[model samples]
Target: KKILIVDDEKPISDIIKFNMTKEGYEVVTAFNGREALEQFEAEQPDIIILDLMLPDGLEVAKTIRKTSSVPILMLSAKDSEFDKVIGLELGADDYVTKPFSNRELQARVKALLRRS
Candidate 1:
C-alpha cells in the first residue's frame, strides 16, 4: 500500500519514510499543504500522515473529506485534548502528537488501514 506524508519538517518526513518503507509501504511526501493536495490528487494514496501545522493543513483534510474516505492520521504538536478533538471533528481518522514513538505511529497506521 501507499502512504502520503505531509510535514514541513523534512526530518520528520524522512524518518517516517524510512520506517514505513521498511514495513513494505510505498511512501510519498509533501512539505506544504498545497503540495500535499497536489500529491493527493496525483497519487491517491491509501492513507495520509498530515501535519496539523502545515499552513492550512486542517483545510486540506476538510477538502479531502469532501470527496474521499481515505483514512487521515494527523500529526500535531499540540498536547491538549481540544486540538485532537478538533482534528477528529474535521475528519481525521486518528492523530499522533509530536514526539510520538515510531512504533506507535506505525501501529496506528496499520490499524486505520485495517479498518478502512
Candidate 2:
C-alpha cells in the first residue's frame, strides 16, 4: 500500500519517507502542490499525510479534500484551536501538532491506516 505525504519542506518528507518505507509501505513524497496531485494520480495513495502551512503548503490539503475519501492526517505547527478546526472543516481525518514525537506520528499514521 502507498502513503502519500504531501509537504512543502523537503526535510519532513525525508524523515517520513525514511521511516515509513517499512516492510509493506510504498511512501510517496511531494514538495509542492502540483507534485502532490501528480503523485496522487499516479500512485492512488491509500492514506494521506498533509503538512499544512502557508504560501505553498496549504493548497494540496485543499486539493485532496476536494478529491479523496480516505483519511487525511494533517501535521502542522498551526496547532491553535482555530487552525485545528479549520482542518476539520476541510475534511481532515486526524491532526497532529508540530514538535511532535516521530514515534507518536508513526503510531498515529498506523492507527489512521488501521482505522480507515
Candidate 3:
C-alpha cells in the first residue's frame, strides 16, 4: 500500500517514511500542504498521514474531502478535544498528536486502513 506523509518538518517526515518503509509499505513525502495535494493527485496514495498544524493543512483537507474519500490520519500538536472533533468533522479518519511515538503512529495508520 502507498502512504503519503505530509509534514513541513523534514525530520518528522523522514522518520515516518523510514519506519513505514521498513514495515514494507511504499512511502511518499511532502514538505508542505501544496506539495501534499500535488502528490495526492499524482501518486493517488492509498492513505495520507497528515499534519493539521501545517501552513495550509485545513485547506488541503478541504480540497481533498471535496471529491476524495481517501483515508486521512491527521497529526497535530494541539491538545484540545475540540480540534480533534473539527478534524474528524472535516473528513479525517484518525489523528495523532505531535511528540508521538512511531509505534503509536503506525498503530493509527493500520487502524485507519482497516476501517477504510
Candidate 4:
C-alpha cells in the first residue's frame, strides 16, 4: 500500500521511509502541511503518518476529514499529551509518541496497515 510520511524532521522521516520501504510498501514524503496535502491529493496514499504538533499535520487532518476517510497515524512528542487524545477524536486512527523505538513505531504502522 502507498504510505505518506509527513514530518519536518529529516532523520525521523528518513528512518520511517526506509523501514516502510523495506516492508515493500510505496512511500512518499512531505515536510510541511501544505505539501502534505498537495502530495496526498496528487498521490492518494493509503495511509498517512503525520506529526501532531505541526500545524500542517493538524491542518491536513482537519481538511481531509471534511471529505476523505483515509486513515491517519499521528506522531507526537510525549510531553504534548493532548495531541494524542485529540488526534484520535480528530479522526486519526492511532498515534505514536515521539522518541519511540523503531519496533514500536513499526508495530503501530503495521497495525494501521492491517486495519486499512
Candidate 5:
C-alpha cells in the first residue's frame, strides 16, 4: 500500500519515508498542501500522514475529506490537545505530535492501517 506524506519540511518527510519504506510500504512525498492534493488525486494513496500546519493547513484536510475517506494521520508541532481534537473532528483518524519517535510513529501507522 502507498502512504502519502504531506509536509513542507523535507527532512521530516524524508525520515518518515525512509522508515516507512524499511517497513515495506511505498511512500510519496509532497512539500506543500497544493502539491499534496495533486499527488493525492494522482496517487490515490491508501493512507496519508498529514501536517496540520501546512501552508493551507486545515483547508487542505477539508479539501481532501471532500473527496476521499482515505485514512489520515495528522502530524503537527501544535501542542494543544484542542488542535488534535479539532483535527480528529475534521476526519483525521489519528495524530502524532512533533518530536515524536520513529518507532512510535510507525506503530501508529501500522495500527491505523490494520484497523482499515
Candidate 6:
C-alpha cells in the first residue's frame, strides 16, 4: 500500500520512511503541510501518517477531510491531551503518541488499512 508521511522532523520522517518501506509499503514523504497537501493530491496514498507538530498540520487534516475519506493516522507528543482528541474529532482515523514502538505503529497501520 502507499503511505504518505508528513513531518517536519527529518530524522523522524526518515525513520518512518525506512521502516514503512521495510514493511513493503510505497512511502511518499513531505516535510511540511503544504508539501503534504501537494503530495496527497498527486499520490492519493492509501494512508497518511501526519505529525501535529507542524504549523499547519491540523489545518491540513481538516482540509484533506473535505475531499477524501482516505485514512489518517496522527502523531503527537504524549502530553498533547487536547491535540489527540482534536485530531480524532477532525477526522483522523487513528493516532500514535510520540516515542511509539515501530512494531506498534506498523500494527496500527495494518489495522487502519484493514478497516479502510
Reference-based TM-score, model 2: 0.87
Write one digit per residue (lDDT tens) for candidate 5, span 1-115: 8999999998998999999999999999998889999999999999999998776667788889998888899998997989989999988998789999999999999898899
Give the range of the ten consecutive residues with the poorest summed lDDT in model 1: 51-60
Per-prediction tally of clashes: 0, 0, 0, 0, 0, 0
- Candidate 1 has an lDDT of 0.94
Decide which is better by TM-score, 2 or 5: 5
User: Per-residue alpha-carbon lDDT of model 1 for 24-57, expressed as tens digits?
Assistant: 9999999998999999999999999999997577
lDDT by residue for model 6 (17-115), tens: 999999999999999999999999999999999998774778999999999999999997744668778889989898799888999999999999999
Candidate 4 RMSD to the correct structure: 1.5
lDDT of 3 by residue, 1-116 (tens): 99999999989889999999998999989988889999999999999999986756777888999889999988989869998898888888887888899998888888888888
Residue pairs in collision within model 5: none
lDDT of 4: 0.84
* Best-matching candidate per lDDT: 1
Best by TM-score, which number? 1
Give the poorly placed runs of model 2, Cα more than 4 Å off: 54-58
Would you estimate the TM-scores of all the predictions? 0.97, 0.87, 0.95, 0.90, 0.95, 0.96
Q: Tell me how far the alpha carbon of residue 59 in candidate 5 is from the true structure, in angstroms, after superposition.
A: 1.1
Question: What is the overall TM-score of model 1 with all chains considered together?
Answer: 0.97
Alpha carbon lDDT of each predicted model: 0.94, 0.79, 0.89, 0.84, 0.90, 0.92
State which candidate, 4 or 5, has the greater TM-score.
5
Model 1 bad stretches (over 4 Å):
none
Error of 5 at 98 (Å): 0.7
Kindly give the stretch of ten consecutive residues in candidate 3 with the minimal lDDT sum. 53-62
| Of 1 and 6, the candidate ranking higher by TM-score | 1
